[PDB]
Amino acid sequence: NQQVVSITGAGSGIGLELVRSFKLAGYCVSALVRNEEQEALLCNEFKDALEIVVGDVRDHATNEKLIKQTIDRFGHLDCFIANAGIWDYMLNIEEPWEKISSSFDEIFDINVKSYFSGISAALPELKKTNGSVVMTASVSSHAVGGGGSCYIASKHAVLGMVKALAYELAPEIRVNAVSPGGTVLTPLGFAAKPEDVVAPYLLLASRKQGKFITGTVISIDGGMALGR
Amino acid sequence: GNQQVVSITGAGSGIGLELVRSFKLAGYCVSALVRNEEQEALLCNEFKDALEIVVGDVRDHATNEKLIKQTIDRFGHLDCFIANAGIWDYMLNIEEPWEKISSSFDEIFDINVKSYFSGISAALPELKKTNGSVVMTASVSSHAVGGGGSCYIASKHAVLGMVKALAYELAPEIRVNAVSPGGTVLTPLGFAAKPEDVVAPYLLLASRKQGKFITGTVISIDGGMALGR
Amino acid sequence: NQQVVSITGAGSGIGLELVRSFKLAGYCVSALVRNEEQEALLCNEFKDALEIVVGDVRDHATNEKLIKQTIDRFGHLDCFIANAGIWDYMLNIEEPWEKISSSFDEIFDINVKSYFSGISAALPELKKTNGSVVMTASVSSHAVGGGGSCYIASKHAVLGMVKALAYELAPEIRVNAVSPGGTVLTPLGFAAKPEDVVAPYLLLASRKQGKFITGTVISIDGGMALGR
Amino acid sequence: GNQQVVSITGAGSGIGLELVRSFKLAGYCVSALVRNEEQEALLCNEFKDALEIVVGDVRDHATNEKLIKQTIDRFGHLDCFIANAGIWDYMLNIEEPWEKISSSFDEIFDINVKSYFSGISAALPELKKTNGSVVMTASVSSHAVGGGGSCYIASKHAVLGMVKALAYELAPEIRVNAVSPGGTVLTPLGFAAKPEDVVAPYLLLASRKQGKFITGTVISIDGGMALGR
């Protein structure tokens, strides 16, 4: 019953808090970080207990490497958490197409194609454990206001991933998402720290508590998806 | 303050009974509204007198007030109200004679919708003192068709409406959320879940730690049923 | 191919504009109005060309009477448009339960149970023409801001009606809805007059143009369902 | 001013060709972007030289600029831009070798999403002068599963995202909406629709009279397919 999770976007923000939270909950954890300074940050805390890969989620071999080192260290993979993401800083549709086009390629490369890449790399091992995927979506998957059109459209595509993959991969593999927002002015009156938004990830990964949850997006946004 | 207190309608059967067992196991003081004396005896055989139990009909406002009043007197405050008592419509067709439709509609909306309003009205002053939360039981019928007739599906969509309107209205003080279970006691995940399997979202949504940033949210737990067959 | 429509809530607002619009488009029209002054208002314009019933949608016999007089005058019924509705004037959940309870009963009696009543009364004739239903929903069926909790919940229930009835009654009868809002400050910068929101009703009723539309809600709200 | 002008991508086949025929019949001046010369000849055999036609690939930004530029030179202004060119993924499975997934993904998102951005970028300055509208072709795959693989469904969900973000961003000047067709050439309505059957929502959404109050909206026209089987 020893469970193993692999987390992209793990070197900062919600991803770093997920590493802490799944470690605290008993999981073995591997982590994909952008750079060596983030790797040292995890090493100062967990010493050698993690498998850490330093690389770019946009490279598929980096994703294959993360799974390969996970299985080689811990033997199997139970949950893959696709989380690395990037903002568009409210890029307006009026801008020069040269800027729109390059920003689109990066936003969609990281926020959407990387998830396909990470899940393709993780799938053969998730089938042997009948494991699960948890993707990071956004308030921008549901409402306008928190990004430009490129970002909001990339976060909607992730919602389509959840429903399509959950359906294709059931009954064997559960696929879900978490839609955080307003973190680090909401109806709840505060911005949350990344530590406050981790619990939905743990429920959706849990083999006991989430055994019957697939196709589901859990919003955790202070009510931003509602009104302002 | 540490000690948390939760009050649960529809608590003598199905999901509601498992919410009692689950919240008691997590350390809550639990009060519970139950339909009859047999269900009361079920809860006493297991928990003796640790619970506060009211027997009666959730469609009666005074009963909801009684549930709250006993909760406060027995436990002092109220942190979470779970409105969960529900009724089905057994796939009532719209072709049926209006006399039957009219009766079922009154029973479905009184129980699945109006009595959610009544429970929340009765719980509000105490939830404001603790800045607590509400969790409503919605349904897979809140999102997709197939699992009921049109009365049931319309009532479960109305619950989605309450979740959004009340969460907006009561913020920042009170959080309001819902759980949409489905296919309980054939899904894409290949099995029907026991009520014991679907309680974790309620615990998350009531927890002041894990759920402090969640309002207006609806957590589906349906084995993929909303996705389709 | 002569088409016949029956409209509730026809004496004012969108309902009155639907009477004008379907008449202008060639339909025979019957209309349910609240009172005799509204009936005179329609008579001043259309003289005796309509079947007008004066009554309360909450009474089922009034709904049966509207269909009965429609068939007796025009022979058949092609489209039923459930439109009568009522607001809650932002009734807060904090109010005395006595006020909440009575307001709920009226809001749900008119906005939801009346639609079931009108459709039950209209169904046997819609089956013979394989006709259609068009319900009036609201921006409040999708977003908060335009009503109290009772109203917003009643308008969500109508969305559930559309999906349930469309599914139960297909292939024979199409069931759809229109969600108007901000009529008589939106992102489009103006409030619309009821005349501006009628075209979706005509498309969903049209036997040629809407032959393939069922289960559908058409928002016409100046973008209110978006942001503010 | 009376005379309206519409520009349509994906115009040589399927729904796009029927949009040409439908808008021409409603009285518009029509320009059209088409994939090859055979489809150009199809449009000329029917309309002679009344149309402005550009042959080329919607994934190339300069082609979109060319479409607009010819529209203005031939007709003076532009009232509506319909981004409609699409491609399927033939139920590509996520188990397939990544080389294949990576290729399909690039082709699907370039055509179904990126080139919508490109067309709208090219049309914007002219739509602002007329305070015109945009209509995008979404899909039943924007709402439900079943009608594609995960790439296709994700791209069609991204279009829903564009509709909401652009309508919010461009208001009050420019309206932005979408049509979600499905099951074209088994549905709850019992038949598959010809492309000729699904054009009315586009006409409504482009009309400055009938659609002046519609933005951020998506009109499903799918025979009930989103409801389920």
Short mmCIF file of N, CA, C and O in Angstrom, two decimals, chain B residues 98, chain C residues 6-9 30-33 53-71 77 80-84 109-110 112-123 125:
data_model
loop_
_atom_site.label_atom_id
_atom_site.label_comp_id
_atom_site.label_asym_id
_atom_site.label_seq_id
_atom_site.Cartn_x
_atom_site.Cartn_y
_atom_site.Cartn_z
N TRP B 98 -51.67 14.91 -14.48
CA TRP B 98 -51.14 16.05 -13.75
C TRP B 98 -51.30 15.89 -12.24
O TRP B 98 -50.45 16.34 -11.48
N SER C 6 -48.36 28.96 -28.71
CA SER C 6 -49.09 29.41 -27.54
C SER C 6 -48.10 29.96 -26.52
O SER C 6 -47.13 29.28 -26.20
N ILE C 7 -48.35 31.16 -26.00
CA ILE C 7 -47.39 31.92 -25.20
C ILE C 7 -48.01 32.27 -23.84
O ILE C 7 -49.05 32.94 -23.78
N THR C 8 -47.37 31.84 -22.74
CA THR C 8 -47.74 32.37 -21.43
C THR C 8 -46.90 33.61 -21.09
O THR C 8 -45.88 33.90 -21.72
N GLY C 9 -47.34 34.35 -20.07
CA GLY C 9 -46.71 35.62 -19.73
C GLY C 9 -46.75 36.62 -20.86
O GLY C 9 -45.83 37.44 -20.99
N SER C 30 -51.84 32.05 -29.74
CA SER C 30 -52.65 32.24 -28.54
C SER C 30 -51.77 32.74 -27.40
O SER C 30 -50.55 32.55 -27.39
N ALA C 31 -52.41 33.38 -26.42
CA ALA C 31 -51.71 34.15 -25.42
C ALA C 31 -52.44 34.08 -24.09
O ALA C 31 -53.66 34.23 -24.04
N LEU C 32 -51.68 33.86 -23.01
CA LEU C 32 -52.21 33.86 -21.66
C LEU C 32 -51.73 35.15 -20.98
O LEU C 32 -50.52 35.38 -20.87
N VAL C 33 -52.68 35.98 -20.54
CA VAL C 33 -52.36 37.26 -19.92
C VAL C 33 -52.89 37.28 -18.49
O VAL C 33 -53.80 36.53 -18.14
N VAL C 53 -56.53 34.15 -23.41
CA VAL C 53 -57.08 33.66 -22.16
C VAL C 53 -56.53 34.55 -21.05
O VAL C 53 -55.34 34.88 -21.06
N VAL C 54 -57.40 34.98 -20.14
CA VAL C 54 -57.02 35.81 -19.01
C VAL C 54 -57.04 34.93 -17.77
O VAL C 54 -58.10 34.41 -17.41
N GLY C 55 -55.89 34.75 -17.13
CA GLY C 55 -55.85 33.86 -15.99
C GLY C 55 -54.47 33.79 -15.37
O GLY C 55 -53.58 34.57 -15.70
N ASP C 56 -54.31 32.80 -14.48
CA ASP C 56 -53.12 32.62 -13.65
C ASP C 56 -52.45 31.30 -14.05
O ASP C 56 -53.09 30.25 -13.97
N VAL C 57 -51.18 31.37 -14.48
CA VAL C 57 -50.47 30.15 -14.88
C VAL C 57 -50.38 29.14 -13.74
O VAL C 57 -50.15 27.95 -13.98
N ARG C 58 -50.53 29.59 -12.50
CA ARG C 58 -50.45 28.67 -11.37
C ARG C 58 -51.66 27.75 -11.29
O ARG C 58 -51.59 26.73 -10.61
N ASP C 59 -52.75 28.08 -11.97
CA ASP C 59 -53.90 27.19 -12.01
C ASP C 59 -53.79 26.30 -13.25
O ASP C 59 -53.71 26.82 -14.37
N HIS C 60 -53.81 24.98 -13.04
CA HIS C 60 -53.61 24.05 -14.15
C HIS C 60 -54.76 24.09 -15.16
O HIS C 60 -54.55 23.92 -16.36
N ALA C 61 -56.00 24.28 -14.68
CA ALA C 61 -57.14 24.40 -15.59
C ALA C 61 -57.00 25.61 -16.50
O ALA C 61 -57.41 25.57 -17.66
N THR C 62 -56.44 26.71 -15.99
CA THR C 62 -56.15 27.85 -16.87
C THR C 62 -55.21 27.45 -18.00
O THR C 62 -55.38 27.90 -19.15
N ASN C 63 -54.23 26.59 -17.71
CA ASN C 63 -53.31 26.13 -18.74
C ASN C 63 -54.01 25.19 -19.72
O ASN C 63 -53.83 25.30 -20.94
N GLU C 64 -54.80 24.24 -19.19
CA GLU C 64 -55.61 23.38 -20.04
C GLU C 64 -56.55 24.19 -20.92
O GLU C 64 -56.74 23.88 -22.10
N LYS C 65 -57.16 25.24 -20.36
CA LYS C 65 -58.06 26.10 -21.12
C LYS C 65 -57.33 26.78 -22.27
O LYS C 65 -57.86 26.87 -23.38
N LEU C 66 -56.11 27.26 -22.02
CA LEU C 66 -55.33 27.91 -23.07
C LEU C 66 -55.06 26.97 -24.22
O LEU C 66 -55.19 27.36 -25.39
N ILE C 67 -54.69 25.72 -23.94
CA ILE C 67 -54.47 24.78 -25.03
C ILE C 67 -55.79 24.44 -25.71
O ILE C 67 -55.87 24.40 -26.94
N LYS C 68 -56.83 24.20 -24.92
CA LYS C 68 -58.11 23.81 -25.50
C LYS C 68 -58.62 24.88 -26.45
O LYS C 68 -59.01 24.58 -27.59
N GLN C 69 -58.58 26.15 -26.03
CA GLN C 69 -59.03 27.21 -26.94
C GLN C 69 -58.09 27.36 -28.14
O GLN C 69 -58.54 27.78 -29.22
N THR C 70 -56.80 27.04 -27.98
CA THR C 70 -55.89 27.10 -29.12
C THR C 70 -56.27 26.07 -30.18
O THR C 70 -56.41 26.41 -31.36
N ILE C 71 -56.46 24.81 -29.78
CA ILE C 71 -56.82 23.77 -30.75
C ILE C 71 -58.19 24.05 -31.36
O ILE C 71 -58.41 23.81 -32.55
N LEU C 77 -51.41 22.54 -32.32
CA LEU C 77 -50.42 23.35 -31.61
C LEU C 77 -49.04 22.89 -32.03
O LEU C 77 -48.74 21.69 -31.96
N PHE C 80 -45.12 25.50 -27.77
CA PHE C 80 -45.54 26.06 -26.50
C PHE C 80 -44.37 26.83 -25.90
O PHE C 80 -43.26 26.29 -25.81
N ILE C 81 -44.61 28.08 -25.49
CA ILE C 81 -43.55 28.94 -24.98
C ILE C 81 -43.92 29.32 -23.55
O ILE C 81 -44.78 30.17 -23.33
N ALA C 82 -43.26 28.67 -22.59
CA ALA C 82 -43.48 28.94 -21.17
C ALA C 82 -42.62 30.12 -20.77
O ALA C 82 -41.39 30.03 -20.80
N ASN C 83 -43.25 31.22 -20.40
CA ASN C 83 -42.50 32.45 -20.23
C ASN C 83 -42.88 33.24 -18.99
O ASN C 83 -42.04 34.01 -18.52
N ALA C 84 -44.07 33.08 -18.44
CA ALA C 84 -44.44 33.88 -17.28
C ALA C 84 -43.44 33.64 -16.14
O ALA C 84 -43.00 32.52 -15.91
N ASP C 109 -43.71 28.33 -7.50
CA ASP C 109 -45.00 28.09 -8.15
C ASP C 109 -45.04 28.68 -9.54
O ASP C 109 -45.53 28.05 -10.49
N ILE C 110 -44.58 29.92 -9.69
CA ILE C 110 -44.68 30.56 -10.99
C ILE C 110 -43.55 30.13 -11.90
O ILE C 110 -43.78 29.68 -13.03
N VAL C 112 -41.34 27.62 -11.88
CA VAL C 112 -40.99 26.23 -12.15
C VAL C 112 -42.23 25.36 -12.29
O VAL C 112 -42.39 24.66 -13.30
N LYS C 113 -43.09 25.32 -11.26
CA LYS C 113 -44.22 24.41 -11.32
C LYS C 113 -45.17 24.78 -12.45
O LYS C 113 -45.73 23.90 -13.11
N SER C 114 -45.32 26.08 -12.72
CA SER C 114 -46.17 26.49 -13.85
C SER C 114 -45.66 25.96 -15.18
O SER C 114 -46.47 25.68 -16.07
N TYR C 115 -44.34 25.83 -15.34
CA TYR C 115 -43.82 25.32 -16.61
C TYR C 115 -44.17 23.85 -16.77
O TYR C 115 -44.62 23.43 -17.85
N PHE C 116 -43.97 23.06 -15.71
CA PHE C 116 -44.45 21.69 -15.73
C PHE C 116 -45.93 21.64 -16.09
O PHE C 116 -46.36 20.81 -16.89
N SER C 117 -46.72 22.55 -15.49
CA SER C 117 -48.16 22.55 -15.72
C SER C 117 -48.48 22.89 -17.17
O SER C 117 -49.26 22.19 -17.83
N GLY C 118 -47.86 23.95 -17.70
CA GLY C 118 -48.13 24.32 -19.08
C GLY C 118 -47.71 23.25 -20.06
O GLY C 118 -48.37 23.02 -21.07
N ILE C 119 -46.59 22.57 -19.78
CA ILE C 119 -46.09 21.55 -20.70
C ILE C 119 -46.92 20.27 -20.59
O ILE C 119 -47.15 19.59 -21.59
N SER C 120 -47.31 19.90 -19.38
CA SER C 120 -48.23 18.77 -19.23
C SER C 120 -49.52 19.02 -20.01
O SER C 120 -50.02 18.13 -20.71
N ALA C 121 -50.06 20.23 -19.91
CA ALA C 121 -51.28 20.55 -20.64
C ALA C 121 -51.07 20.55 -22.15
O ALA C 121 -51.99 20.19 -22.90
N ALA C 122 -49.88 20.94 -22.61
CA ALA C 122 -49.62 21.08 -24.04
C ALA C 122 -49.10 19.80 -24.69
O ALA C 122 -49.11 19.70 -25.92
N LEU C 123 -48.67 18.82 -23.90
CA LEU C 123 -47.95 17.66 -24.44
C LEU C 123 -48.76 16.84 -25.45
O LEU C 123 -48.21 16.50 -26.51
N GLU C 125 -50.94 17.52 -27.59
CA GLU C 125 -51.04 18.17 -28.89
C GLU C 125 -49.68 18.35 -29.55
O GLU C 125 -49.58 18.26 -30.77
#
